[model samples]
Target: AADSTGYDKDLVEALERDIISQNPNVRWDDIADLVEAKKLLKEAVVLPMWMPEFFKGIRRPWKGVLMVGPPGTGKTLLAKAVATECKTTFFNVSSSTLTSESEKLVRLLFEMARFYSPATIFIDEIDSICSSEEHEASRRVKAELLVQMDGVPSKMVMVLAATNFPWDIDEALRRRLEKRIYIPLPSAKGREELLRISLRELEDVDLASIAENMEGYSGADITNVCRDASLMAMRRRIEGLTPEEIRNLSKEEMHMPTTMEDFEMALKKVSKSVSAADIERYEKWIFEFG
Candidate 1:
């Protein structure tokens, strides 16, 4: 409210209205498996804040940390978990935020984040949206971002960014990011955990086999397997009914457990692609320079 004394009306409003999502309640338990990332994040951001004096000399706080992963692998959710668990102000800025005003929004974001110090500014999907055609404005905005990140330790701000296309990140930005970690495809244990979270009340003989088959599946792809299977049970109830008849049917007709047969049928429907080549691609990137 006191921003009228110094800051602009529009940009400040824009930051509060959308770019700032202070604390989305995504906990560690909510995420399936990303164990190393969580531990590393706590060290990078949380530890520094908790034991500021201890993290002196060579162990200065990390300016920026990049979580490189494929699409929809809880990258955004991981960022939220940092905000919630560490109890910091969270600025969730997506690519859309950079669509207009470019550097102004970035400048405003960091300023507001400073006002609420000990903040985690998470830029979701931050590959090269900050770079398009190498125009002056685009480069200015990106350079501005790096400047803010380098200043993170000034006011206890931690820039946590995620990207599907890590290779696209510029050399300067990559260097500033400091800690680059890969969020890989989940383990069998993680897949089983994912299935259990999705199916809640449903018991399983098929879970063992399902988790076995889903070797290279992304986390969302695993969830889709369960989702498709649940829908299969709903389809069987109304296979012969007309639309009007289905509307009039009892709710009890839909209250069925996810059967093994449902998974058997739905598995085929969602198995279009797996990450055989993707694993190599990402691993190659990490090995090359990460």
Candidate 2:
């Protein structure tokens, strides 16, 4: 999965299994709130990729350091939000497979890491886990993951690993990686950023008013509706015009710009994909697990 390594079919399956989703591009600003924690990741984890010499002088030798990893139980909402941010090849290692008979996976996980060197190996829901020290296979799987962690230090890979019940994971593993971060059930801070990020060139759209009134729609949904509204005023204008006129005009035909009024109208048609019940159920699952 890189410039020139012929990956084995078996290992590649392991690699793809854990990598549930891959973001093509995500900037650091995409995630909102947790201000200092994100900055801590920036100054400590990501910056090293930028200035190796400067970070070395600061006594953070990149080789042995875990560089970046965050842990917590949270909405899948948070998972999708930050996946876009890690410039590193971000891969989510679903927790169930780790403790299963799939011990063949751990080694190949590292194998693909060197293939895609700058990957952020994200382990999700280790809370639903087996590093309980009981299952002999799981114990070895735990051993294997930690073994992989050891090799990780020398590579360009990082971890944004997380689970809700941090207490459920191995006691030793907890101490090895520090700090915790989570995505919320649509925080105003994050929702506000979601709105601001969505309206790229529509500079005059009143973001403050829109974000507050958005009523906990999924961030992506909120972003989608804003565009829906923005396109509304233009659609109305284009509705009366002939196809020949519109085809020739393209975007230049637009004299009507979008507004808060347009947003209010768009909400009448477009709604959230993730409903309020979606949040309620995920929280209940965390309650049961955590």
Candidate 3:
């Protein structure tokens, strides 16, 4: 059955409109063809605004959940999207947030989950904080997190963690992560969908050809390809102009409205940054469904 977390186009729209997502490297809106993954994440991570009595017994203590993916695939966006969709209080902690004596950090992490019991606690680049080896204070950080997690009142809060290197995580942390999922690069269909949405406002682009050529692109790469191309085109328009003049150009002049040719150049530039073998690796994982 589809739950309330299943779809909230309005909430997504509001996020796109109001909340500037953290992954600047990714055009967050263009992460394509993961509707099923998105739904899975929502159900796993999004805490409903209101707690019904039946859920009281099941209780959701913070079991670690991992979002592992290749670089530039928008794991951060996935966590944020889950937070927005559920409309719960959100605690977004990066690695730096952990290195503090303030019990408030530990207390605040869970207190939000308690105050907004049905909330989402999202930690990004968890590997930095939960690395398996080489740190003195890491254990203290881990214990603080462990207590906060175990202390959550039954079935109430959700913990969502994301990392690129799943293998390096502490074995103990991995054990805690009951549900682990991999986010991979876009498939052909996914590429096509992303092209359709991200380029929706642009004109005269050969969508089919562009999408087809982007067979091995990550969502982050696709986003950068679009933006870098646009900027490059704009740069060409102001090549001989003064910096002040270029800065003063109107949106129409500065935007230069990127072209398919611009994208072609960008593809050559950014696509070269990744390897064909890398694509094969992610492809294997994506199609290797269990």
- Superposed Cα deviation of residue 71, candidate 3 (Å): 2.2
Deviation from native of the Cα of residue 137 in model 3, angstroms: 1.5
CA error at residue 217 for candidate 1, angstroms: 1.6
TM-score against native, each model:
0.87, 0.57, 0.71
- TM-score of candidate 2 on Cα atoms, chains taken together: 0.57
lDDT of 3 by residue, 197-216 (tens): 77676532376778788875
Worst 10 residues of 1 by lDDT: 1-10
- Which predicted model would earn the best lDDT? 1
Clashes of 3: 3
User: CA lDDT of each candidate?
Assistant: 0.76, 0.57, 0.61
User: For model 2, which pairs clash?
Assistant: 26-84, 72-163, 73-163, 73-164
lDDT of 3 at 104: 40
lDDT of 1 by residue, 9-64 (tens): 77678778776766468878878877888888888877777777787585843578
Q: Number of clashes in every candidate structure?
A: 0, 4, 3
